[PDB]
């Protein structure tokens, strides 16, 4: 039960009869203390049972360093772990992980991979856990090749990498450029029977989008979609902005379609890649009617969107709206910049 106040109550009473607690008194307390994150009451307890000469263990310890972990108080959480180790007390898989974690999270990497070293010394074996925090801490710090030396260790030493450890590898290297390896990690993943997710796939089409492979963006956009993984606005995005550089204008438009099919919300990205796209096509009907649509969607348009489509009219010696378009432009508190300007005064000087 949860019934602390009662416990607490009860060892009042029993230090006031003569009666003396002794260890599992102390560690039930400081345990039910710990999980509620009563920890400066925990570590009342923890003292007063050390100055009553009684010899605190392994669940001590832990308990106290796993509740100091979860409330972000790790610079205690490392001064018990000294103390513990002094008082030859030997720390556990819990132990040493609840500390990598934490030091990970910080960003404390160098320090968290001294304290894996020493389980190693120490015969406590590392799990998926202590690998994928440590994967994670490193991946969030650019240390990418650090990271995939670790999941080559975790593989060697039979422990099973999730979709986490997976994500956080194909995420570093789809950043890095180094796409053939992301891709080559996402194949092993899948055929281990690691199941790719959202981000697994957002991220693999961000970086082949980037890379101008479409064609391979486009085939795991399919499978993601076969597969029930549910594409999101970033997805969308990118391949928009993919096919809209390789000049593939007529498919942006269809995707763009599709994804408001699917009640994903574009953005003043998805809007102005198109905007862009349809006005160096000439295609000025289409660029003003979706113009008008991210208006009545909220989505407010920038000077990109504004230069583009006053270029855009320009060319198509559509003067007077495009001085329209100007007027609103100042209107709406967007600046012009020296491809409005000068926009204007070659279709007005002509």
């Known amino acids: 039960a949860g019934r602390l106040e009662e416990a607490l109550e009860l060892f009042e009473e029993m230090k006031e009869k003569g009666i003396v607690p002794d260890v599992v008194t102390y560690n039930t307390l400081i345990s039910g203390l710990g999980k509620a994150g009563r920890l400066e009451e925990a570590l009342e307890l923890f003292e007063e049972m050390k100055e009553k000469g009684i010899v605190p263990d392994v669940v001590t310890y832990t308990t106290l360093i796993s509740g100091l972990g979860k409330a972000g108080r790790l610079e205690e959480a490392l001064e018990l772990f000294e103390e513990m180790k002094e008082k030859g007390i030997v720390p556990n898989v819990v132990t040493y992980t609840t500390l990598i974690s934490g030091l990970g999270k910080a960003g404390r990497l160098e320090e968290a991979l001294e304290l894996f070293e020493e389980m190693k010394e120490k015969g406590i074996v590392p799990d998926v856990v202590t690998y994928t925090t440590l994967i994670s801490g490193l991946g969030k710090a650019g240390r990418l090749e650090e990271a ?15 979709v ?16 053939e390896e992301a891709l080559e990690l996402f194949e092993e993943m899948k055929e281990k029977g690691i199941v790719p997710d959202v981000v697994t796939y957002n991220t693999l089409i961000s970086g082949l989008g980037k890379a ?18 549910v594409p999101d606005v970033v997805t969308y995005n990118t391949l928009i902005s993919g096919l809209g550089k390789a000049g ?12 408001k099919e699917k009640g994903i919300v574009p953005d003043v990205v998805t ?40 270029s855009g009219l320009g060319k198509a ?24 300007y000068t926009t204007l005064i070659s279709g007005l000087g002509k």
């Not at 593939?248 to 994804?259: G, I, Q, S, T, V």
Request: net charge negative.
């Open 148 to 162: 995939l030396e670790l999941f080559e260790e975790m593989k060697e030493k039979g422990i099973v990498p999730d």
């Open 164 to 179: 986490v450890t997976y994500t956080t590898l194909i995420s570093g290297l789809g950043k890095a450029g180094r796409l």
């Open 212 to 229: 101008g492979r479409l064609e391979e963006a486009l085939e795991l956009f399919e499978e993601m979609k076969e597969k029930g993984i």
């Open 248 to 259: 593939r204008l007529e498919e942006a438009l269809e995707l763009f379609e599709e994804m």
């Open 271 to 310: 809007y102005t890649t198109l905007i862009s796209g349809l006005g160096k096509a000439g295609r000025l009907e289409e660029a003003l009617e979706l113009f008008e649509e991210m208006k009545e969607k909220g989505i407010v348009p920038n000077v990109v969107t504004y230069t583009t489509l006053i």
């Open 317 to 340: 010696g559509r003067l007077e709206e495009a001085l329209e378009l100007f007027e609103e432009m100042k209107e709406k508190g967007i600046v012009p910049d020296v491809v409005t």
